Write a protein that binds this ligand. Sequence first.
Ligand SMILES: Nc1nc2c(ncn2[C@@H]2O[C@H](COP(=O)(O)OP(=O)(O)OP(=O)(O)O)[C@@H](O)[C@H]2O)c(=O)[nH]1
Ligand SMILES: [Mg+2]
Length: 165
Amino acid sequence: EVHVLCLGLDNSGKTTIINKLKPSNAQSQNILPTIGFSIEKFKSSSLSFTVFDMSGQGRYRNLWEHYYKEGQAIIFVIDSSDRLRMVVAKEELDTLLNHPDIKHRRIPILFFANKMDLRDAVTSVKVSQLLCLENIKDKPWHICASDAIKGEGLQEGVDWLQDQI
Ligand SMILES: Nc1nc2c(ncn2[C@@H]2O[C@H](COP(=O)(O)OP(=O)(O)OP(=O)(O)O)[C@@H](O)[C@H]2O)c(=O)[nH]1
Ligand SMILES: [Mg+2]
């Protein structure tokens, strides 16, 4: 019953995170850059998900807005270890948030400050400061640190998302 858009730059960990939310039997073992986008399903405590897992490469970011009218929730993923590319991420977040099909809907945004395990990684608090998430006033949001390979942090996000729905 719940349609989610998974957005963020390429190499942020989007497909790794979505994969980890799946039952063990359903999980992919070799995750490659997404070609355009994919549609996945996962399940939480009592919620069934359809996820538009978009490629975040520059080549395919044009596709995102085509699917905005069926984001009932957004999962936006940040590579915590890459401050330089985080400037590009913030630009895209700001465009997303101001888009005609997004700006007037109270849609919940879950952020993941992913790749928390890497030495250069910024904390979820620091990410929230850097992206200026405090400025999001008309939508519910939450941010988590995550290590998507291990699965650390994903439970809290999914739990927050489920509450919002
Ligand atoms: N160390 C570490 N590596 C991660 C983490 N999450 C994802 N990765 C790795 O980062 C690379 C990119 O992960 P993907 O899930 O393919 O990234 P993406 O956002 O889906 O990229 P696109 O589909 O190209 O937009 C892969 O090699 C993953 O194994 C993490 O939390 N920690
Ligand atoms: Mg991907």
